[PDB]
């Protein structure tokens, strides 16, 4: 096998956590117990630390989000908002390549738009959430339910109106992270001050286009979130799947570790291919972000870690809080014996939970490290967090 070498001292970026989505008008409100399932920490809890929620098109619907975000802001969690639609008296069609049912915003209502935007950042003030942040626009470059923005009427926006959102700012929301909607912000000084956030989607995103050299040159000081995902499908009662809910793992593994990314959030929370069941418990899928989510705090920063170390073996490793946490997949039908080797900190005890066939984030062995490593098992179809002391 290998050595798995864990860099206390290379810090890698912050994390600000993992979450998803709550849409009461499509998919119906979390219960009181839901909600207590999606955001405590405690046993068979999610221990989600972001809930992103919708920017409604009409301002009288607005009350519907504020239950739930409360709920999350109880718990720790960060609020964060991304809007579908500007109010219908804001839209105007237009040509896109032939098509002329295309909606965009008109170009006078810019100003209009983000006063829309600022009101609900202060109606959710009134009601006892501090919005984290808010975004531009969901999917400005996949609109065809909804609003269409090109490249360039995203950077004016950026430029010129997104200056007067009294909050941290995202932008653009790519349904793929497509280079193209983001480059002209990030190429542009005036709207990249104005932007807190960038965020994408991956959907259809190959893990060769995860990394971002141009963000890596021109973001500095500016977090970058993973706003929306399933994977790897939303095949109907298929959360409880095994192996394929391993999946799920892997692709944090990789937004992680190739996309640096800093949030990475879930679509809907509750639903049949989602973290959580219709019938409130958590899925296998749920399980497999709760690897990261319950352990992953926000504060906690990546650290440096051979990432393959073993054929359809993946780990990365956090720290934060006098612990070191490590997160090692095992995608093969092999269990692997691995030795992990913590560079630059002293240890003693590390305690751990498997997800594996016939087992949700259920505790293994306690084990000690003598000399700097420690060795430990990774069973075969299985992802294992490890909780350094
Ligand atoms: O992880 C496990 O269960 C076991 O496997 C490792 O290979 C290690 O050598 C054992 O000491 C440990 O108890
Ligand atoms: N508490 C810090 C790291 C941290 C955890 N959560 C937020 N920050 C430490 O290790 O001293």
Same mark, same amino acid.
């Given at each position: ?98 098509? &002329?049912?295309? !909606?965009?915003?008109?170009? =006078?209502? $810019? *100003?209009?738009?983000? %006063?829309?935007?600022? +009101?609900?950042? &202060?109606?959710? !003030?009134?009601?006892?959430? =501090?919005? $984290? *942040?808010?975004?531009? %626009?969901?999917?400005? +470059? ?248």
């Amino acid at each position: 096998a290998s050595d798995v070498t864990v860099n206390v001292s290379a810090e890698k970026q912050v994390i600000r956590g993992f979450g998803g989505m709550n849409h009461p008008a499509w998919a119906g409100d979390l219960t009181a117990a839901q909600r207590e399932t999606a955001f405590g920490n405690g046993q068979n809890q999610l221990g989600f630390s972001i809930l992103r929620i919708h920017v409604d098109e009409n301002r009288n619907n607005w009350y519907k989000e504020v239950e739930t975000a409360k709920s999350a802001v109880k718990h720790g969690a960060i609020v964060f908002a991304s809007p579908w639609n500007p109010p219908s008296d804001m839209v105007e069609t237009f040509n896109r390549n032939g098509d &002329t049912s295309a !909606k965009r915003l008109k170009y =006078n209502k $810019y *100003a209009a738009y983000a %006063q829309h935007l600022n +009101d609900f950042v &202060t109606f959710m !003030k009134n009601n006892g959430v =501090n919005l $984290y *942040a808010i975004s531009v %626009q969901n999917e400005p +470059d996949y609109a065809h339910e909804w609003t269409w923005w090109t490249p360039q009427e995203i950077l004016r926006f950026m430029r010129e109106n997104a200056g007067s959102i009294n909050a941290r700012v995202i932008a653009p929301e790519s349904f793929q992270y497509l280079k193209n909607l983001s480059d002209p912000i990030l190429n542009d000084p005036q709207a990249l001050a104005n932007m807190d956030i960038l965020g994408t989607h991956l959907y259809g995103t190959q893990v060769s286009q995860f990394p971002y050299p141009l963000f890596k040159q021109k973001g500095a000081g500016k977090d970058l979130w993973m706003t929306e995902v399933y994977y790897p499908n939303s095949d109907t009662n298929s959360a409880d799947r095994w192996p394929e809910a391993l999946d799920v793992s892997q692709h944090i593994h990789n937004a992680m570790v190739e996309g640096d990314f800093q949030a990475y959030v879930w679509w809907y929370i509750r639903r049949s291919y989602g973290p959580m069941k219709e019938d409130g418990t958590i899925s296998k899928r749920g399980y497999n972000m709760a690897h990261f989510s319950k352990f992953v705090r926000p504060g906690y920063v990546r650290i440096d870690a051979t990432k393959n170390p073993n054929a359809n073996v993946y780990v990365s490793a956090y720290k934060g809080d006098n612990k070191v946490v490590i997160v090692a997949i095992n995608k093969s039908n092999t269990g692997v014996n691995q030795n992990f080797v913590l560079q630059n900190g002293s240890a003693s005890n590390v305690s751990r939970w498997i997800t594996s066939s016939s087992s949700n984030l259920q505790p293994g062995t306690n084990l000690t490290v003598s000399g700097n490593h420690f060795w430990a098992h990774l069973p075969a179809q299985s992802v294992t967090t490890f909780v350094v002391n």
